[PDB]
Amino acid sequence: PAAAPNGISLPAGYKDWKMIGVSSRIEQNNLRAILGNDIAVKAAREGRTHPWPDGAILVKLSWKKSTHELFPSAEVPGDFTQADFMVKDAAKYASTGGWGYARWLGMEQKPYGANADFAQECMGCHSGAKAADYVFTHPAKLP
Amino acid sequence: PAAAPNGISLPAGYKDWKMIGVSSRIEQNNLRAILGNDIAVKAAREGRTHPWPDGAILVKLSWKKSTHELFPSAEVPGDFTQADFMVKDAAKYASTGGWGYARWLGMEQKPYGANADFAQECMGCHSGAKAADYVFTHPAKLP
Ligand code: HEC
Ligand code: HEC
């Protein structure tokens, strides 16, 4: 796939990354999985998030909600909508809270954003999570 | 952790397994992640699910739904409730449709079931998916 408008390349093999958590957004009618590279997953599990370490990459994968034919009360993934990424580099991405933001749309992997300044949209909401280093997700608890 | 009543041991390192899908069960008020070992993940991605191959292991992880303090419309994991497993061995588990079923409850990982016949409960529902080799989950679509 083409790079994002700010120059960020799509991380190869993100579909093999370990699970950090899951979510459902009522207003978007979607289901989401949150995965990370090994630096991200080690930080998540030890609570090294004030701040997240350089080299951590988070991905969020979104699907439209659909219902299971044999069990209609189970909400399950339908069409794939987007892959959203945050790349930690405190020096390189100082103007956007130390994070490099990027999104690719659909099974076609089309890069999102009108121009190289697109990540200001992402900051509009993610600045609300400034006390948690711009990340909303609380890693899911496991034994 | 202690073994299940049918003698199945808790699969070690399941939290490091690759993602097959996600779900939300309305009547249970939860969120779930579906992971698998590398035998199951190969079979899922290649469509080799008639039947699933011997050695495939599927896990479902469940959390109570909670809402994000900074974004109330985001439904997110709360307390960890259970880990559910299905281990494919067509010969060994021929009496339960070719799958070895087991559940461990909570952060303490307490084995579920009154006695060695507990998996007949699981079969009561999972026999509804008998045409799909007793598995409801459709692997989530990714590029
Ligand atoms: C989840 C997200 C993630 C995971 C990291 C995190 O902060 O939890 C990424 C990589 C990402 N987003 Fe953002 N996003 C928002 C909220 C509330 C959540 C948590 C709940 C859930 O699982 O859905 C997010 C909020 C918003 C938002 C407010 C309307 C906007 C405009 C955005 N996000 C925008 C972006 C991006 C701009 C292209 C981008 C690359 C994001 N998010 C990455
Ligand atoms: C999901 C499940 C999985 C993953 C494999 C699959 O079939 O998709 C495992 C390892 C497992 N269960 Fe079962 N379960 C049910 C349904 C509808 C789904 C798909 C939707 C979702 O993601 O939630 C399941 C249904 C039922 C059910 C009907 C009320 C019962 C009684 C059970 N499941 C019982 C069990 C087990 C008995 C202890 C067990 C080990 C299960 N499920 C494993």
Short mmCIF file of C-alpha atoms and ligand atoms in Angstrom, two decimals:
data_model
loop_
_atom_site.label_atom_id
_atom_site.label_comp_id
_atom_site.label_asym_id
_atom_site.label_seq_id
_atom_site.Cartn_x
_atom_site.Cartn_y
_atom_site.Cartn_z
CA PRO A 1 0.00 0.00 0.00
CA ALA A 2 0.99 3.67 -0.50
CA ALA A 3 2.44 5.59 2.46
CA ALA A 4 0.19 7.92 4.52
CA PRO A 5 0.35 11.69 3.61
CA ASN A 6 2.81 12.30 6.48
CA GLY A 7 5.24 9.64 5.12
CA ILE A 8 4.37 6.74 7.50
CA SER A 9 4.59 3.28 5.80
CA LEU A 10 1.98 0.56 6.59
CA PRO A 11 3.58 -1.78 9.22
CA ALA A 12 4.04 -5.22 7.58
CA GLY A 13 2.36 -8.25 9.23
CA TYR A 14 0.25 -6.27 11.78
CA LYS A 15 -2.41 -8.98 11.52
CA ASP A 16 -0.02 -11.36 13.46
CA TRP A 17 0.48 -8.93 16.40
CA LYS A 18 -0.57 -9.80 20.00
CA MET A 19 -3.92 -8.62 21.47
CA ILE A 20 -4.04 -5.58 23.88
CA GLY A 21 -7.87 -5.30 24.01
CA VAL A 22 -11.29 -5.06 22.23
CA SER A 23 -14.08 -2.45 22.06
CA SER A 24 -17.45 -1.57 20.55
CA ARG A 25 -18.39 2.03 19.51
CA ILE A 26 -22.15 2.55 19.82
CA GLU A 27 -22.27 5.63 17.51
CA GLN A 28 -20.15 3.91 14.77
CA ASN A 29 -22.03 0.58 14.87
CA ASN A 30 -18.69 -1.31 14.85
CA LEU A 31 -16.57 -3.88 16.65
CA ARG A 32 -12.80 -3.26 17.19
CA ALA A 33 -9.64 -5.19 18.06
CA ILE A 34 -6.57 -3.38 19.53
CA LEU A 35 -3.23 -5.12 18.81
CA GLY A 36 0.42 -3.92 19.28
CA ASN A 37 3.99 -4.74 18.23
CA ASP A 38 6.14 -6.50 20.86
CA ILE A 39 7.44 -3.19 22.36
CA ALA A 40 3.82 -1.96 22.72
CA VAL A 41 2.56 -5.22 24.20
CA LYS A 42 5.37 -5.39 26.81
CA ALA A 43 4.61 -1.71 27.81
CA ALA A 44 0.85 -2.41 27.99
CA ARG A 45 1.25 -5.47 30.24
CA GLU A 46 3.67 -3.72 32.70
CA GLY A 47 1.83 -0.34 32.72
CA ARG A 48 4.76 1.57 31.11
CA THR A 49 2.34 4.16 29.60
CA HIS A 50 3.41 7.50 31.26
CA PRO A 51 4.74 7.78 28.61
CA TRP A 52 4.60 4.83 26.20
CA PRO A 53 8.23 3.98 25.07
CA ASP A 54 9.74 4.96 21.71
CA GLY A 55 9.16 2.22 19.13
CA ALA A 56 5.70 1.13 20.47
CA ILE A 57 3.12 0.75 17.67
CA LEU A 58 -0.65 0.40 18.40
CA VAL A 59 -3.20 -0.72 15.74
CA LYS A 60 -7.00 -0.61 15.93
CA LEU A 61 -8.95 -2.78 13.46
CA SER A 62 -12.67 -1.97 12.86
CA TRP A 63 -15.52 -4.00 11.30
CA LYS A 64 -19.19 -3.15 10.83
CA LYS A 65 -21.45 -5.04 13.29
CA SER A 66 -23.32 -7.99 11.79
CA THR A 67 -25.34 -10.83 13.38
CA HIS A 68 -24.72 -14.52 13.47
CA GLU A 69 -27.23 -16.60 11.40
CA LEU A 70 -27.32 -19.51 13.98
CA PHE A 71 -27.26 -17.23 17.08
CA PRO A 72 -28.87 -13.84 16.27
CA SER A 73 -27.99 -12.15 19.63
CA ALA A 74 -24.23 -12.47 18.91
CA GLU A 75 -22.86 -9.29 17.33
CA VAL A 76 -19.94 -10.35 15.09
CA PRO A 77 -17.66 -8.75 12.43
CA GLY A 78 -19.02 -7.94 8.97
CA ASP A 79 -17.22 -5.82 6.35
CA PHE A 80 -13.72 -4.53 7.30
CA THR A 81 -13.72 -0.70 7.60
CA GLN A 82 -10.20 0.56 8.56
CA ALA A 83 -6.83 0.07 10.26
CA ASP A 84 -5.74 2.96 12.54
CA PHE A 85 -2.10 3.22 13.79
CA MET A 86 -0.13 5.27 16.41
CA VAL A 87 3.73 5.07 16.16
CA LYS A 88 5.62 6.37 19.28
CA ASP A 89 8.70 8.61 18.53
CA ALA A 90 8.82 11.51 21.05
CA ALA A 91 11.42 13.57 19.02
CA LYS A 92 10.28 12.79 15.43
CA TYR A 93 6.54 13.36 16.16
CA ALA A 94 6.92 16.14 18.83
CA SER A 95 4.27 18.34 17.04
CA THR A 96 1.58 15.62 17.45
CA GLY A 97 2.09 14.57 21.16
CA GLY A 98 5.06 12.28 20.29
CA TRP A 99 2.85 9.97 18.17
CA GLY A 100 2.79 9.36 14.38
CA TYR A 101 -0.86 8.88 13.36
CA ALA A 102 -1.94 7.03 10.15
CA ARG A 103 -5.12 5.31 8.77
CA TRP A 104 -5.68 2.93 5.78
CA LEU A 105 -9.29 2.31 4.58
CA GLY A 106 -10.96 -1.02 3.72
CA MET A 107 -9.76 -4.29 2.17
CA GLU A 108 -8.32 -1.96 -0.59
CA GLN A 109 -5.92 -0.28 1.96
CA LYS A 110 -6.39 3.31 0.69
CA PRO A 111 -4.42 5.93 2.74
CA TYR A 112 -6.63 8.49 4.56
CA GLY A 113 -6.16 12.28 4.72
CA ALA A 114 -6.41 15.37 2.48
CA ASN A 115 -2.72 16.45 2.97
CA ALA A 116 0.32 16.02 5.29
CA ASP A 117 -1.54 17.93 8.12
CA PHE A 118 -4.36 15.28 8.42
CA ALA A 119 -3.20 14.08 11.91
CA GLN A 120 -4.59 17.35 13.45
CA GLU A 121 -8.06 15.68 13.11
CA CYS A 122 -6.88 12.70 15.18
CA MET A 123 -5.44 15.09 17.85
CA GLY A 124 -8.87 16.85 18.08
CA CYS A 125 -10.15 13.84 20.05
CA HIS A 126 -6.89 12.21 21.30
CA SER A 127 -5.83 15.41 23.16
CA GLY A 128 -8.78 14.51 25.46
CA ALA A 129 -6.59 11.57 26.66
CA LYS A 130 -3.43 13.80 27.24
CA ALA A 131 -3.25 12.60 30.94
CA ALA A 132 -2.83 9.01 29.59
CA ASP A 133 -0.20 9.98 26.91
CA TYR A 134 -2.95 10.47 24.21
CA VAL A 135 -4.11 6.78 24.37
CA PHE A 136 -7.71 5.93 25.45
CA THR A 137 -7.41 2.08 25.52
CA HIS A 138 -6.94 0.48 28.99
CA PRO A 139 -5.19 -2.88 28.30
CA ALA A 140 -7.62 -5.78 29.00
CA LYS A 141 -6.89 -7.73 32.23
CA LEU A 142 -5.69 -11.40 31.89
CA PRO A 143 -4.16 -13.89 34.39
CA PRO B 1 -3.82 -24.16 37.20
CA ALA B 2 -5.74 -27.36 37.97
CA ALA B 3 -6.87 -29.49 34.95
CA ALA B 4 -10.49 -29.51 33.73
CA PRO B 5 -12.72 -32.41 35.00
CA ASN B 6 -12.16 -34.29 31.69
CA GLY B 7 -8.36 -34.08 32.27
CA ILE B 8 -7.59 -31.24 29.72
CA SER B 9 -4.66 -29.02 30.91
CA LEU B 10 -4.83 -25.21 30.49
CA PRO B 11 -2.94 -24.38 27.22
CA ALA B 12 0.23 -22.49 28.15
CA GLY B 13 0.91 -19.07 26.49
CA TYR B 14 -2.58 -18.57 25.00
CA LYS B 15 -2.37 -14.79 25.70
CA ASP B 16 0.37 -14.63 22.98
CA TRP B 17 -1.82 -16.27 20.29
CA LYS B 18 -2.96 -14.53 17.04
CA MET B 19 -6.45 -13.01 16.64
CA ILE B 20 -9.19 -14.90 14.71
CA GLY B 21 -12.08 -12.51 15.62
CA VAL B 22 -14.07 -10.50 18.19
CA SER B 23 -17.75 -10.52 19.42
CA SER B 24 -20.29 -8.94 21.76
CA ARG B 25 -23.02 -11.18 23.36
CA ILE B 26 -25.94 -8.84 24.13
CA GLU B 27 -27.68 -11.25 26.57
CA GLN B 28 -24.40 -11.79 28.50
CA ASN B 29 -23.42 -8.07 28.60
CA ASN B 30 -19.86 -8.80 27.56
CA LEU B 31 -17.08 -8.35 25.04
CA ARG B 32 -15.03 -11.31 23.66
CA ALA B 33 -11.76 -11.94 21.82
CA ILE B 34 -11.35 -15.15 19.78
CA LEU B 35 -7.68 -16.27 19.41
CA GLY B 36 -6.14 -19.53 18.11
CA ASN B 37 -2.86 -21.47 18.09
CA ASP B 38 -0.89 -21.33 14.82
CA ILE B 39 -2.52 -24.60 13.53
CA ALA B 40 -6.01 -23.02 14.01
CA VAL B 41 -4.95 -19.60 12.56
CA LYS B 42 -3.56 -21.25 9.34
CA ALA B 43 -6.80 -23.31 8.95
CA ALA B 44 -8.97 -20.16 9.55
CA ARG B 45 -7.14 -18.03 6.96
CA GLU B 46 -7.01 -20.86 4.32
CA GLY B 47 -10.74 -21.84 4.78
CA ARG B 48 -9.76 -25.36 6.05
CA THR B 49 -12.63 -25.49 8.53
CA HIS B 50 -14.50 -28.76 7.19
CA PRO B 51 -13.42 -30.06 9.46
CA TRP B 52 -10.80 -28.08 11.37
CA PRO B 53 -7.51 -30.04 11.45
CA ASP B 54 -6.32 -32.12 14.45
CA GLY B 55 -4.17 -29.99 16.80
CA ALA B 56 -6.15 -26.75 16.16
CA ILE B 57 -6.98 -24.94 19.46
CA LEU B 58 -9.52 -22.07 19.69
CA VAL B 59 -9.83 -19.80 22.78
CA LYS B 60 -12.51 -17.26 23.69
CA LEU B 61 -11.76 -14.62 26.30
CA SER B 62 -14.69 -12.77 27.94
CA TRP B 63 -14.88 -9.51 29.95
CA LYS B 64 -17.87 -7.66 31.49
CA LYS B 65 -18.84 -4.57 29.41
CA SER B 66 -17.80 -1.27 30.95
CA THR B 67 -17.84 2.29 29.52
CA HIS B 68 -14.92 4.54 28.95
CA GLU B 69 -14.74 7.42 31.52
CA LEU B 70 -13.49 9.97 28.81
CA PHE B 71 -15.72 8.69 25.99
CA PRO B 72 -19.01 7.17 27.37
CA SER B 73 -20.21 5.70 24.02
CA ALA B 74 -17.11 3.40 23.89
CA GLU B 75 -17.97 -0.02 25.44
CA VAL B 76 -14.67 -1.47 26.78
CA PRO B 77 -13.48 -4.47 28.92
CA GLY B 78 -14.10 -4.53 32.66
CA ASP B 79 -13.58 -7.51 34.92
CA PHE B 80 -12.19 -10.74 33.26
CA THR B 81 -14.85 -13.50 33.50
CA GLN B 82 -13.58 -16.69 31.72
CA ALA B 83 -11.39 -18.45 29.12
CA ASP B 84 -13.19 -21.07 26.97
CA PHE B 85 -11.20 -23.63 24.86
CA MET B 86 -11.92 -26.16 22.08
CA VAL B 87 -9.03 -28.62 21.26
CA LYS B 88 -9.44 -30.55 17.94
CA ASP B 89 -8.61 -34.31 18.13
CA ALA B 90 -11.02 -36.27 15.93
CA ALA B 91 -10.02 -39.68 17.48
CA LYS B 92 -9.35 -38.69 21.17
CA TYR B 93 -12.57 -36.61 21.54
CA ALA B 94 -14.79 -38.59 19.15
CA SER B 95 -17.49 -38.79 21.91
CA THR B 96 -17.90 -34.92 21.92
CA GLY B 97 -17.95 -34.22 18.15
CA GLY B 98 -14.15 -34.44 17.79
CA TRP B 99 -13.44 -31.44 20.14
CA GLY B 100 -12.12 -31.33 23.70
CA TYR B 101 -14.04 -28.57 25.58
CA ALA B 102 -12.75 -26.81 28.76
CA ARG B 103 -13.38 -23.53 30.73
CA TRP B 104 -11.36 -21.75 33.45
CA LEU B 105 -13.10 -19.01 35.55
CA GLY B 106 -11.64 -15.53 36.42
CA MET B 107 -8.19 -14.26 37.35
CA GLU B 108 -7.84 -17.28 39.78
CA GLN B 109 -8.29 -19.74 36.78
CA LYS B 110 -10.74 -22.12 38.62
CA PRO B 111 -11.75 -25.11 36.43
CA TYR B 112 -15.48 -25.21 35.50
CA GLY B 113 -17.79 -28.24 35.71
CA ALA B 114 -19.54 -30.54 38.28
CA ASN B 115 -17.91 -33.73 36.95
CA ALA B 116 -16.15 -35.34 33.95
CA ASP B 117 -19.40 -35.20 31.84
CA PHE B 118 -19.58 -31.27 31.97
CA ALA B 119 -18.88 -30.90 28.18
CA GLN B 120 -22.39 -32.20 27.35
CA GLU B 121 -23.59 -28.66 28.37
CA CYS B 122 -21.27 -27.08 25.74
CA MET B 123 -22.55 -29.58 23.12
CA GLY B 124 -26.19 -28.56 23.87
CA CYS B 125 -25.52 -25.24 22.11
CA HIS B 126 -22.51 -26.11 19.86
CA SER B 127 -24.53 -28.98 18.18
CA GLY B 128 -26.49 -26.09 16.52
CA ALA B 129 -23.24 -25.46 14.55
CA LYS B 130 -22.69 -29.18 13.71
CA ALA B 131 -22.72 -28.48 9.90
CA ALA B 132 -19.78 -26.07 10.50
CA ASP B 133 -17.81 -28.63 12.64
CA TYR B 134 -19.37 -27.31 15.95
CA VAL B 135 -17.76 -23.79 15.55
CA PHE B 136 -19.90 -20.59 15.32
CA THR B 137 -17.08 -18.06 14.73
CA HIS B 138 -16.49 -16.87 11.16
CA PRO B 139 -12.86 -15.65 10.96
CA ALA B 140 -12.77 -11.80 10.65
CA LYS B 141 -11.83 -10.49 7.18
CA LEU B 142 -8.50 -8.61 6.80
CA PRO B 143 -6.41 -7.64 3.71
C1 HEC C 1 -8.93 4.41 19.51
C2 HEC C 1 -7.71 4.62 18.71
C3 HEC C 1 -6.53 3.78 18.66
C4 HEC C 1 -5.99 2.88 19.79
C5 HEC C 1 -5.24 3.86 20.71
C6 HEC C 1 -6.13 4.55 21.71
O1 HEC C 1 -6.08 5.79 21.91
O2 HEC C 1 -6.90 3.83 22.41
C7 HEC C 1 -5.75 4.23 17.56
C8 HEC C 1 -4.48 3.61 17.10
C9 HEC C 1 -6.39 5.38 17.06
N1 HEC C 1 -7.55 5.63 17.78
FE1 HEC C 1 -8.72 7.33 17.57
N2 HEC C 1 -9.89 6.64 19.10
C10 HEC C 1 -10.85 7.40 19.77
C11 HEC C 1 -11.38 6.73 20.92
C12 HEC C 1 -12.35 7.29 21.92
C13 HEC C 1 -10.80 5.49 20.95
C14 HEC C 1 -10.97 4.44 22.09
C15 HEC C 1 -12.31 3.65 22.02
C16 HEC C 1 -12.36 2.66 20.88
O3 HEC C 1 -11.81 1.55 20.99
O4 HEC C 1 -13.00 3.02 19.83
C17 HEC C 1 -9.88 5.46 19.81
C18 HEC C 1 -11.33 8.68 19.32
C19 HEC C 1 -11.02 9.30 18.07
C20 HEC C 1 -11.71 10.48 17.55
C21 HEC C 1 -12.84 11.26 18.20
C22 HEC C 1 -14.08 11.40 17.30
C23 HEC C 1 -11.04 10.81 16.38
C24 HEC C 1 -11.32 11.97 15.42
C25 HEC C 1 -10.03 9.84 16.22
N3 HEC C 1 -10.00 8.92 17.22
C26 HEC C 1 -9.09 9.76 15.15
C27 HEC C 1 -7.99 8.86 15.01
C28 HEC C 1 -7.03 8.95 13.96
C29 HEC C 1 -6.92 10.06 12.89
C30 HEC C 1 -6.80 9.52 11.46
C31 HEC C 1 -6.15 7.87 14.21
C32 HEC C 1 -4.93 7.45 13.34
C33 HEC C 1 -6.54 7.25 15.40
N4 HEC C 1 -7.69 7.84 15.92
C34 HEC C 1 -5.86 6.13 15.97
C1 HEC C 2 -18.16 -19.32 21.20
C2 HEC C 2 -17.31 -20.37 21.71
C3 HEC C 2 -15.91 -20.58 21.37
C4 HEC C 2 -15.15 -20.23 20.09
C5 HEC C 2 -15.53 -21.23 18.99
C6 HEC C 2 -16.87 -21.00 18.34
O1 HEC C 2 -17.70 -21.95 18.30
O2 HEC C 2 -17.12 -19.89 17.81
C7 HEC C 2 -15.35 -21.48 22.25
C8 HEC C 2 -13.93 -21.94 22.35
C9 HEC C 2 -16.43 -21.93 23.04
N1 HEC C 2 -17.59 -21.27 22.68
FE1 HEC C 2 -19.50 -21.70 23.39
N2 HEC C 2 -20.24 -20.22 22.14
C10 HEC C 2 -21.56 -20.05 21.82
C11 HEC C 2 -21.76 -19.14 20.74
C12 HEC C 2 -23.08 -18.76 20.13
C13 HEC C 2 -20.49 -18.68 20.36
C14 HEC C 2 -20.26 -17.71 19.20
C15 HEC C 2 -20.62 -16.24 19.54
C16 HEC C 2 -19.69 -15.56 20.56
O3 HEC C 2 -18.56 -15.18 20.15
O4 HEC C 2 -20.10 -15.45 21.75
C17 HEC C 2 -19.59 -19.38 21.25
C18 HEC C 2 -22.60 -20.66 22.57
C19 HEC C 2 -22.55 -21.50 23.72
C20 HEC C 2 -23.69 -21.94 24.51
C21 HEC C 2 -25.16 -21.65 24.20
C22 HEC C 2 -25.90 -20.99 25.36
C23 HEC C 2 -23.10 -22.75 25.52
C24 HEC C 2 -23.81 -23.50 26.65
C25 HEC C 2 -21.69 -22.74 25.25
N3 HEC C 2 -21.35 -22.00 24.16
C26 HEC C 2 -20.76 -23.48 26.00
C27 HEC C 2 -19.36 -23.61 25.81
C28 HEC C 2 -18.49 -24.41 26.61
C29 HEC C 2 -18.91 -25.34 27.73
C30 HEC C 2 -18.08 -25.24 29.02
C31 HEC C 2 -17.22 -24.19 26.04
C32 HEC C 2 -15.89 -24.77 26.52
C33 HEC C 2 -17.42 -23.35 24.92
N4 HEC C 2 -18.73 -22.96 24.76
C34 HEC C 2 -16.38 -22.89 24.05
#
